[PDB]
Design a protein around this ligand. Sequence first.
Ligand SMILES: Cc1cccc(C)c1OCC(=O)N[C@@H](Cc1ccccc1)[C@@H](O)C[C@H](Cc1ccccc1)NC(=O)[C@H](C(C)C)N1CCCNC1=O
Ligand SMILES: [Cl-]
Ligand SMILES: [Cl-]
Ligand SMILES: [Cl-]
Ligand SMILES: [Cl-]
Lengths: 99, 99
Amino acid sequence: PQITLWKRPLVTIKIGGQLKEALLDTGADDTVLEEMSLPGRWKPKMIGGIGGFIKVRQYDQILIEICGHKAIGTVLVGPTPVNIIGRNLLTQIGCTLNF
Amino acid sequence: PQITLWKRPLVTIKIGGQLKEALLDTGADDTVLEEMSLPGRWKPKMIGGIGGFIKVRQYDQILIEICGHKAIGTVLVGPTPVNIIGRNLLTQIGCTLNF
Ligand SMILES: Cc1cccc(C)c1OCC(=O)N[C@@H](Cc1ccccc1)[C@@H](O)C[C@H](Cc1ccccc1)NC(=O)[C@H](C(C)C)N1CCCNC1=O
Ligand SMILES: [Cl-]
Ligand SMILES: [Cl-]
Ligand SMILES: [Cl-]
Ligand SMILES: [Cl-]
């Protein structure tokens, strides 16, 4: 697709068999979803946003589908206000900015 | 240009007679810059996201140049950790996401 930016670039993702809404975010280095269960072990990470840093759980090698495009990569889980698809998965699905 | 997302999409902007580096941020509704002076009237605003809320000054009808593309819009100024070009100005330069 080509997605314009007059509204938030929200898309449907699928993770753990569940559909969620998430923001395609070129300003985010990594992908972070609101609290949920994922398989396997997790490692600690902090990420910084507009108001400061939060602690999240880092899960690696997770299956996630973004607008129908299958990806496998790192997904953070924590106290984010919105589900965010960051550059790590945007690059996987072939996303670029164009003007 | 076509900008890939292996690295942060940082570009040079020109604003208030100054050159600065800023992030092209599809996950931002608004444009927010680190402390600087801008001309004209402003009103206070709170923005919140990851890590909570900051207070900013909202300036309207501000001229900016982003990668050689001119635009006008609202610019927020305050203690953001990074200069952010949000959708309100990304639309004006015809910036889209593509995959
Ligand atoms: C930088 C980073 C590293 C690792 C992982 C992640 C997810 C990372 O990104 C975290 C992050 O908050 N990035 C922001 C820009 C960023 C990068 C680096 C440091 C600080 C910020 C931005 O892109 C997304 C984030 C999304 C959001 C969150 C809560 C509510 C609404 C939107 N958007 C916002 O905060 C914007 C701001 C910038 C005007 N925003 C907040 C007011 C309401 N609407 C809105 O759009
Ligand atoms: Cl749109
Ligand atoms: Cl990854
Ligand atoms: Cl605007
Ligand atoms: Cl358009």
